[PDB]
Amino acid sequence: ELKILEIIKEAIELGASDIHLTAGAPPAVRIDGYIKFLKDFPRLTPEDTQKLAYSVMSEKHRQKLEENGQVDFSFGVRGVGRFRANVFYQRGSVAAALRSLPAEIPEFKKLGLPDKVLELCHRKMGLILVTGPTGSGKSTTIASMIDYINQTKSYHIITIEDPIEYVFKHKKSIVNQREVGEDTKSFADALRAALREDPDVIFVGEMRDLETVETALRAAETGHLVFGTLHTNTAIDTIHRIVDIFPLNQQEQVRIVLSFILQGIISQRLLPKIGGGRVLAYELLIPNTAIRNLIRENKLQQVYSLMQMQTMNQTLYKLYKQGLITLEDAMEASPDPKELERM
Amino acid sequence: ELKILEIIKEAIELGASDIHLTAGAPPAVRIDGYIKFLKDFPRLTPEDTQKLAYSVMSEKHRQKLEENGQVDFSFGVRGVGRFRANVFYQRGSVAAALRSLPAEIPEFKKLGLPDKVLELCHRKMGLILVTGPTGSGKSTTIASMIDYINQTKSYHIITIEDPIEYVFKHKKSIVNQREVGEDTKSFADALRAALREDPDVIFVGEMRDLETVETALRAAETGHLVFGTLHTNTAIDTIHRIVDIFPLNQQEQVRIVLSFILQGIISQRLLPKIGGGRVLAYELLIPNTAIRNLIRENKLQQVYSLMQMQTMNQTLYKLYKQGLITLEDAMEASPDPKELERM
Amino acid sequence: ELKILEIIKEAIELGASDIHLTAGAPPAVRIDGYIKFLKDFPRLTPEDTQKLAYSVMSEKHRQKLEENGQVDFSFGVRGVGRFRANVFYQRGSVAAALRSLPAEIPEFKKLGLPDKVLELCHRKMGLILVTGPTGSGKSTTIASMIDYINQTKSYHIITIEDPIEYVFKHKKSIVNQREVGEDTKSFADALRAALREDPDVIFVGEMRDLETVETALRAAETGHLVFGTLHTNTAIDTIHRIVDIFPLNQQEQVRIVLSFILQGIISQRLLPKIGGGRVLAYELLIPNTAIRNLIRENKLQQVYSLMQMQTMNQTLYKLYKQGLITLEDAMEASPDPKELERM
Ligand SMILES: Nc1ncnc2c1ncn2[C@@H]1O[C@H](COP(=O)(O)OP(=O)(O)OP(=O)(O)O)[C@@H](O)[C@H]1O
Ligand SMILES: Nc1ncnc2c1ncn2[C@@H]1O[C@H](COP(=O)(O)OP(=O)(O)OP(=O)(O)O)[C@@H](O)[C@H]1O
Ligand SMILES: Nc1ncnc2c1ncn2[C@@H]1O[C@H](COP(=O)(O)OP(=O)(O)OP(=O)(O)O)[C@@H](O)[C@H]1O
């Protein structure tokens, strides 16, 4: 009956994205974004959601769920795959939200980016930034690139994540992934340890604290290729942001350094497609002879004009002329309506 | 005799709003706002108000009432309903103030708002703000809306409250309610956990600390519909307030963000009615094509002029022309007498 | 089989720079900068990388790897040499990165610097600064100089390092090396203890905190010859930097003091050579009668012009006219292209 391992069975069996456990109701499941209660077998759950949750939690997690009202952790079931779990107290009673963790890195062509992007993965050092709002394929793009390196280079890759989304098998290189909160205390002191761990590639899950970006740039300018993720929407947004989070006492020297070490920037958005509904739009900036200097001279508004690698709106039109994204979709995604409509 | 469970019996039997326990007197009761001592059965209470209070308190509550001079907690009696209890030391002796907690969410038509409000509950993401002073129906309006969603959408609703006023049954969706101080340490780290708990709707009981509003806006602009409650009196008050509690280093960018994500604002006041005495007045602002831009350009005084959804005074006149609220009632409730009197 | 001591055997046997231990894969090895998995003997490693790592760790290290997710430590195997080890948690599982520590200080002529440098090692007191980015031979140059003193002077040398790179045998003098994190708590309170330890020569591994540079300069101006290492690229960079990290309340008095006590500055870069690939370029400034005063009068841009000891670009041309470093190599290494190309 009420066995967590069997609840999971039925969830993937129905292609569920999430499962939810709360007292009053039977086990719930999110399918296509709709919550459905799998009455199938299990009946309305007693306060012994606590019993189910526990059958999955470590001892330092159960400790934690007491010290504070919630835990965020991952667990693996050999049968199927891996799962992210947030357990918490609801109405004096125990509640849980399990998520499915991706079991397979997509092929690069599957994504939507051009092959001009893959050229970044061959650069010897510098910063590769993939940005965009939560749910625009940032983690996917990175995983595709890190695994592309993994297939082709004899490197030592190190990733610092929150949480570990996709997982890597050893191939031509040797991959180590560290989860903040489980393997290490912080992005920062993990990235600091990373400098002494002989890595070829370093991947910061997120760069939200300044101290991290400060270590992230240090690494980049010291022989490493570093992958980083922001939440910005354009490329100019990105460069402006990481600069304008430093004290303006040598914020100009950030612009100098970034301009040497910034290797490429990809900003992503997932718009609805006409087939299966899933299409990626993007801004792409791989700096060259000219671009490099404009950033040093902080002439960023004039940078946009040289961009013919490809501006965000150009990606929108290209996706429209072929016939995938609609006009208003192409318009609501657009940073500036004025550049389009002209198309 | 002196049995807490029986005292409660007699209180609802007389339709009491509160019951009060203190040493010198017999158990007291608030009926229609007047304190009456139910001599009925129980006699003048000994210092063993402590005995009664305890028969209702958890162990971490009795601990707390020692560590500090008071506790605030909720407890449920299957017989009738749920009760909020504040226990504290009076004159070296134990005292208690129990409140009745609402056992049934009202129908939306019962309230007083138009059906234009219910359209908010269908919005995919953004901020729904219900404001007003304590005792203007904020919690009621929200409960009516969250339960309306609950009846019609297959969502996962999460509320973070202080305390949990109304309680929800699972219906078409799956509802989780977390009480700050019992299930979680803070609004903020509960709202932070909320982001990882796969919710469709998030409800912040109160947004008094900036850090909360900062997370609340983040959630809103990241795919969630978020319900929030202030203490402001007008809609312009509201927008001005949440903006002017951010450091003015990017306080202008709050105005930009709010204008994209602010879905509707309802400000409420409960004026005396001629029948049973209970009528709601309100200001309603659902932004559209034009309004959106005025807020970005911080032209808020000119926003008022476009409002014909409905200004606070228009609600007052409408309630008067029909014959419910008196002239001075309509005047003392009014933000500006000058707009009315002209009616 | 799986014996750490034997894994090491095979690594030096193949002339490895690093060895890497992680669960999924067999023991890895970096040869010529390429990761190769030595399937030779050991098979795919179980989570009992933990077993191997432990056979090398002290008790306060194994404690540490628990308190925090990683340790950085050194260990010695009589058979071959010494090894730097960073152990850390990867995917809930134990991972390790061992480095080879240099077993023999090079002859000074082997380096690339002129004999004008060795004259510094005979100075009675002052500051000798070797600078450059990680991997430009800073530690080598110092070790060559300290050991040169060791062979010829009856001194008491003290070094404070992070970690102890090269190790010294007692010769004509008596050498003491202290590792920050193992023998002492900090560079600073080690340098502070150094003042009371009767040393002739003091060597600060790194001078990143101001408090250190403040003690480092104190020592210099108090009878000691002090060796220090920065990350700057030019000599003017160096002097400007250490000055501009003091509060400008008496930052001018730093310029006065530095100008008395700065004995020499060497800034290094390792460019690719045509033979074995390994050649050193450098900027050299040994102040004299005139130079001393220019620094007091902060006329540093005019200092460059008097430099005919030798400017960075002059070193580049000299290495090119002989035929070692290529034009673009000489150009990309150059601080200013404009000075060269004229050659
Ligand atoms: N380029 C793409 N085209 C179509 N679908 C994609 C693409 N990238 C990702 N997806 C899908 O969309 C969902 C969200 O992707 P992903 O998690 O990579 O984005 P993200 O939220 O920016 O990353 P993160 O996990 O760091 O927040 C996933 O289920 C993924 O399979
Ligand atoms: N629209 C309304 N019309 C008439 N009576 C109402 C209305 N809304 C609430 N009431 C009644 O008035 C009292 C106060 O309502 P409520 O507690 O919702 O207001 P509030 O104090 O603003 O909310 P909160 O509990 O967050 O302070 C309740 O007893 C409720 O039944
Ligand atoms: N002058 C030189 N010429 C050729 N090779 C050198 C020279 N100096 C050092 N090397 C080699 O280059 C590598 C890096 O040298 P070293 O570690 O001294 O530089 P560094 O990184 O500046 O010092 P540190 O250990 O303080 O970071 C070593 O393997 C060393 O053998």
Side-chain angles (χ1 to χ4, degrees):
Chain A
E1 45 157 47
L2 279 303
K3 269 304 297 163
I4 178 141
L5 177 47
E6 197 139 74
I7 299 180
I8 297 159
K9 288 180 163 188
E10 197 181 292
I12 333 138
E13 197 232 308
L14 289 144
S17 63
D18 296 68
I19 99 143
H20 287 262
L21 304 181
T22 175
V29 145
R30 201 195 282 280
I31 300 152
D32 280 342
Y34 298 97
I35 272 86
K36 261 80 196 209
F37 302 98
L38 51 91
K39 31 218 181 177
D40 299 50
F41 198 111
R43 208 201 195 184
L44 285 73
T45 336
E47 187 232 301
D48 304 67
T49 50
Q50 183 273 340
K51 285 249 289 302
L52 285 150
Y54 268 40
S55 55
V56 141
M57 312 175 70
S58 183
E59 256 297 291
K60 302 218 85 180
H61 288 138
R62 319 203 300 195
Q63 201 280 161
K64 256 270 229 167
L65 186 71
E66 300 326 306
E67 198 175 0
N68 275 349
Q70 64 266 16
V71 238
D72 263 284
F73 63 93
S74 315
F75 81 96
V77 162
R78 186 171 291 216
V80 45
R82 295 167 310 107
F83 290 89
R84 222 307 201 261
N86 188 319
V87 186
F88 58 107
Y89 286 119
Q90 163 233 355
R91 232 160 93 258
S93 173
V94 179
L98 319 184
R99 221 223 318 169
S100 197
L101 278 175
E104 203 194 20
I105 294 153
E107 267 221 15
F108 187 83
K109 48 101 97 183
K110 283 187 195 153
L111 263 46
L113 287 321
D115 329 337
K116 289 152 178 170
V117 179
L118 283 172
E119 208 160 23
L120 299 163
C121 287
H122 284 127
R123 299 312 92 174
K124 26 264 156 177
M125 70 216 72
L127 222 191
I128 292 174
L129 283 172
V130 175
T131 66
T134 321
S136 62
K138 304 187 296 288
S139 274
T140 295
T141 296
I142 298 285
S144 271
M145 286 164 84
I146 302 284
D147 176 80
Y148 168 80
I149 297 159
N150 185 17
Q151 295 174 337
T152 54
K153 309 301 279 181
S154 299
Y155 280 8
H156 165 227
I157 308 180
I158 198 168
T159 69
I160 307 150
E161 298 182 59
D162 179 44
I164 311 173
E165 200 69 29
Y166 300 89
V167 169
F168 301 88
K169 299 163 148 221
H170 302 281
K171 270 109 151 180
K172 198 153 170 69
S173 40
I174 174 196
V175 179
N176 284 143
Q177 307 188 265
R178 305 186 84 205
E179 195 165 81
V180 162
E182 214 73 56
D183 303 293
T184 340
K185 271 50 228 155
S186 174
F187 274 93
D189 47 63
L191 222 177
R192 190 143 178 178
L195 290 191
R196 322 202 214 185
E197 268 139 11
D198 186 50
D200 283 288
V201 175
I202 299 156
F203 171 52
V204 258
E206 279 146 353
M207 281 155 53
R208 236 59 203 154
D209 148 50
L210 166 68
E211 180 197 23
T212 306
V213 189
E214 204 176 289
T215 309
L217 288 163
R218 261 297 281 176
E221 69 177 350
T222 202
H224 308 108
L225 224 201
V226 190
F227 286 76
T229 69
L230 278 78
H231 286 299
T232 44
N233 267 126
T234 80
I236 51 153
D237 276 15
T238 323
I239 49 163
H240 235 149
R241 210 263 202 270
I242 48 185
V243 166
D244 289 312
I245 56 167
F246 275 94
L248 57 146
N249 177 272
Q250 41 61 257
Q251 174 254 59
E252 181 273 357
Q253 276 180 335
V254 171
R255 246 135 31 181
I256 305 169
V257 165
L258 192 62
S259 62
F260 200 100
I261 221 64
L262 196 277
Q263 274 285 19
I265 289 178
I266 318 164
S267 298
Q268 306 195 148
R269 285 206 68 87
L270 279 167
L271 287 73
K273 182 201 182 177
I274 304 172
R278 224 62 196 169
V279 139
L280 160 81
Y282 54 84
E283 193 155 69
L284 204 167
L285 170 60
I286 296 166
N288 59 4
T289 324
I291 307 170
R292 295 274 151 120
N293 306 131
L294 279 291
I295 319 151
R296 193 162 292 109
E297 284 183 303
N298 190 51
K299 210 186 181 193
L300 329 169
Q301 303 73 37
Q302 224 276 284
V303 169
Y304 225 114
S305 285
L306 267 307
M307 270 167 59
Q308 318 147 35
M309 253 296 317
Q310 181 170 303
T311 51
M312 228 302 183
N313 283 46
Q314 198 173 346
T315 310
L316 296 156
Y317 160 73
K318 197 162 181 171
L319 268 41
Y320 178 58
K321 70 158 187 187
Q322 202 179 343
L324 298 99
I325 62 170
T326 77
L327 188 78
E328 198 71 42
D329 276 333
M331 278 286 80
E332 273 187 288
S334 182
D336 182 60
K338 270 290 205 302
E339 174 131 23
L340 218 64
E341 103 205 62
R342 213 147 161 170
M343 296 274 72
Chain B
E1 45 157 47
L2 279 303
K3 269 304 297 163
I4 178 141
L5 177 47
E6 197 139 74
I7 299 180
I8 297 159
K9 288 180 163 188
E10 197 181 292
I12 333 138
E13 197 232 308
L14 289 144
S17 63
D18 296 68
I19 99 143
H20 287 262
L21 304 181
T22 175
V29 145
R30 201 195 282 280
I31 300 152
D32 280 342
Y34 298 97
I35 272 86
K36 261 80 196 209
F37 302 98
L38 51 91
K39 31 218 181 177
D40 299 50
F41 198 111
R43 208 201 195 184
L44 285 73
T45 336
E47 187 232 301
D48 304 67
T49 50
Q50 183 273 340
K51 285 249 289 302
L52 285 150
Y54 268 40
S55 55
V56 141
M57 312 175 70
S58 183
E59 256 297 291
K60 302 218 85 180
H61 288 138
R62 319 203 300 195
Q63 201 280 161
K64 256 270 229 167
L65 186 71
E66 300 326 306
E67 198 175 0
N68 275 349
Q70 64 266 16
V71 238
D72 263 284
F73 63 93
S74 315
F75 81 96
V77 162
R78 186 171 291 216
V80 45
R82 295 167 310 107
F83 290 89
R84 222 307 201 261
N86 188 319
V87 186
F88 58 107
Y89 286 119
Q90 163 233 355
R91 232 160 93 258
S93 173
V94 179
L98 319 184
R99 221 223 318 169
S100 197
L101 278 175
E104 203 194 20
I105 294 153
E107 267 221 15
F108 187 83
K109 48 101 97 183
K110 283 187 195 153
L111 263 46
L113 287 321
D115 329 337
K116 289 152 178 170
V117 179
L118 283 172
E119 208 160 23
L120 299 163
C121 287
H122 284 127
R123 299 312 92 174
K124 26 264 156 177
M125 70 216 72
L127 222 191
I128 292 174
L129 283 172
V130 175
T131 66
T134 321
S136 62
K138 304 187 296 288
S139 274
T140 295
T141 296
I142 298 285
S144 271
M145 286 164 84
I146 302 284
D147 176 80
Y148 168 80
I149 297 159
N150 185 17
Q151 295 174 337
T152 54
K153 309 301 279 181
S154 299
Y155 280 8
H156 165 227
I157 308 180
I158 198 168
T159 69
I160 307 150
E161 298 182 59
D162 179 44
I164 311 173
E165 200 69 29
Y166 300 89
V167 169
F168 301 88
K169 299 163 148 221
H170 302 281
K171 270 109 151 180
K172 198 153 170 69
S173 40
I174 174 196
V175 179
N176 284 143
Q177 307 188 265
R178 305 186 84 205
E179 195 165 81
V180 162
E182 214 73 56
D183 303 293
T184 340
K185 271 50 228 155
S186 174
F187 274 93
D189 48 63
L191 222 177
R192 190 143 178 178
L195 290 191
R196 322 202 214 185
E197 268 139 11
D198 186 50
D200 283 288
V201 175
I202 299 156
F203 171 52
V204 258
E206 279 146 353
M207 281 155 53
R208 236 59 203 154
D209 148 50
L210 166 68
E211 180 197 23
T212 306
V213 189
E214 204 176 289
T215 309
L217 288 163
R218 261 297 281 176
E221 69 177 350
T222 202
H224 308 108
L225 224 201
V226 190
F227 286 76
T229 69
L230 278 78
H231 286 299
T232 44
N233 267 126
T234 80
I236 51 153
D237 276 15
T238 323
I239 49 163
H240 235 149
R241 210 263 202 270
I242 48 185
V243 166
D244 289 312
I245 56 167
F246 276 94
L248 57 146
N249 177 272
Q250 41 61 257
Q251 174 254 59
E252 181 273 357
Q253 276 180 335
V254 171
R255 246 135 31 181
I256 305 169
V257 165
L258 192 62
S259 62
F260 200 100
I261 221 64
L262 196 277
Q263 274 285 19
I265 289 178
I266 318 164
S267 298
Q268 306 195 148
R269 285 206 68 87
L270 279 167
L271 287 73
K273 182 201 182 177
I274 304 172
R278 224 62 196 169
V279 139
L280 160 81
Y282 54 84
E283 193 155 69
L284 204 167
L285 170 60
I286 296 166
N288 59 4
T289 324
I291 307 170
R292 295 274 151 120
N293 306 131
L294 279 291
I295 319 151
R296 193 162 292 109
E297 284 183 303
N298 190 51
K299 210 186 181 193
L300 329 169
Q301 303 73 37
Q302 224 276 284
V303 169
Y304 225 114
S305 285
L306 267 307
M307 270 167 59
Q308 318 147 35
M309 253 296 317
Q310 181 170 303
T311 51
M312 228 302 183
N313 283 46
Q314 198 173 346
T315 310
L316 296 156
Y317 160 73
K318 197 162 181 171
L319 268 41
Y320 178 58
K321 70 158 187 187
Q322 202 179 343
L324 298 99
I325 62 170
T326 77
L327 188 78
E328 198 71 42
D329 276 333
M331 278 286 80
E332 273 187 288
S334 182
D336 182 60
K338 270 290 205 302
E339 174 131 23
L340 218 64
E341 103 205 62
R342 213 147 161 170
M343 296 274 72
Chain C
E1 45 157 47
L2 279 303
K3 269 304 297 163
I4 178 141
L5 177 47
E6 197 139 74
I7 299 180
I8 297 159
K9 288 180 163 188
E10 197 181 292
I12 333 138
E13 197 232 308
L14 289 144
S17 63
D18 296 68
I19 99 143
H20 287 262
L21 304 181
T22 175
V29 145
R30 201 195 282 280
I31 300 152
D32 280 342
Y34 298 97
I35 272 86
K36 261 80 196 209
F37 302 98
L38 51 91
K39 31 218 181 177
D40 299 50
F41 198 111
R43 208 201 195 184
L44 285 73
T45 336
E47 187 232 301
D48 304 67
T49 50
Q50 183 273 340
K51 285 249 289 302
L52 285 150
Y54 268 40
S55 55
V56 141
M57 312 175 70
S58 183
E59 256 297 291
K60 302 218 85 180
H61 288 138
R62 319 203 300 195
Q63 201 280 161
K64 256 270 229 167
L65 186 71
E66 300 326 306
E67 198 175 0
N68 275 349
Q70 64 266 16
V71 238
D72 263 284
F73 63 93
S74 315
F75 81 96
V77 162
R78 186 171 291 216
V80 45
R82 295 167 310 107
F83 290 89
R84 222 307 201 261
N86 188 319
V87 186
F88 58 107
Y89 286 119
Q90 163 233 355
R91 232 160 93 258
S93 173
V94 179
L98 319 184
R99 221 223 318 169
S100 197
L101 278 175
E104 203 194 20
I105 294 153
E107 267 221 15
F108 187 83
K109 48 101 97 183
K110 283 187 195 153
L111 263 46
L113 287 321
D115 329 337
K116 289 152 178 170
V117 179
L118 283 172
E119 208 160 23
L120 299 163
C121 287
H122 284 127
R123 299 312 92 174
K124 26 264 156 177
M125 70 216 72
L127 222 191
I128 292 174
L129 283 172
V130 175
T131 66
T134 321
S136 62
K138 304 187 296 288
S139 274
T140 295
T141 296
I142 298 285
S144 271
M145 286 164 84
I146 302 284
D147 176 80
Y148 168 80
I149 297 159
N150 185 17
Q151 295 174 337
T152 54
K153 309 301 279 181
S154 299
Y155 280 8
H156 165 227
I157 308 180
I158 198 168
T159 69
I160 307 150
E161 298 182 59
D162 179 44
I164 311 173
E165 200 69 29
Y166 300 89
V167 169
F168 301 88
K169 299 163 148 221
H170 302 281
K171 270 109 151 180
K172 198 153 170 69
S173 40
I174 174 196
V175 179
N176 284 143
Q177 307 188 265
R178 305 186 84 205
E179 195 165 81
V180 162
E182 214 73 56
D183 303 293
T184 340
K185 271 50 228 155
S186 174
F187 274 93
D189 48 63
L191 222 177
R192 190 143 178 178
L195 290 191
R196 322 202 214 185
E197 268 139 11
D198 186 50
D200 283 288
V201 175
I202 299 156
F203 171 52
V204 258
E206 279 146 353
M207 281 155 53
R208 236 59 203 154
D209 148 50
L210 166 68
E211 180 197 23
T212 306
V213 189
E214 204 176 289
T215 309
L217 288 163
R218 261 297 281 176
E221 69 177 350
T222 202
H224 308 108
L225 224 201
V226 190
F227 286 76
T229 69
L230 278 78
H231 286 299
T232 44
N233 267 126
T234 80
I236 51 153
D237 276 15
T238 323
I239 49 163
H240 235 149
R241 210 263 202 270
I242 48 185
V243 166
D244 289 312
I245 56 167
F246 276 94
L248 57 146
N249 177 272
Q250 41 61 257
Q251 174 254 59
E252 181 273 357
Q253 276 180 335
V254 171
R255 246 135 31 181
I256 305 169
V257 165
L258 192 62
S259 62
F260 200 100
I261 221 64
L262 196 277
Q263 274 285 19
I265 289 178
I266 318 164
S267 298
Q268 306 195 148
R269 285 206 68 87
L270 279 167
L271 287 73
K273 182 201 182 177
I274 304 172
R278 224 62 196 169
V279 139
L280 160 81
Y282 54 84
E283 193 155 69
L284 204 167
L285 170 60
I286 296 166
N288 59 4
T289 324
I291 307 170
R292 295 274 151 120
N293 306 131
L294 279 291
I295 319 151
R296 193 162 292 109
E297 284 183 303
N298 190 51
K299 210 186 181 193
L300 329 169
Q301 303 73 37
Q302 224 276 284
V303 169
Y304 225 114
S305 285
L306 267 307
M307 270 167 59
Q308 318 147 35
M309 253 296 317
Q310 181 170 303
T311 51
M312 228 302 183
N313 283 46
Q314 198 173 346
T315 310
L316 296 156
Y317 160 73
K318 197 162 181 171
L319 268 41
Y320 178 58
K321 70 158 187 187
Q322 202 179 343
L324 298 99
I325 62 170
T326 77
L327 188 78
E328 198 71 42
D329 276 333
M331 278 286 80
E332 273 187 288
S334 182
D336 182 60
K338 270 290 205 302
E339 174 131 23
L340 218 64
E341 103 205 62
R342 213 147 161 170
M343 296 274 72

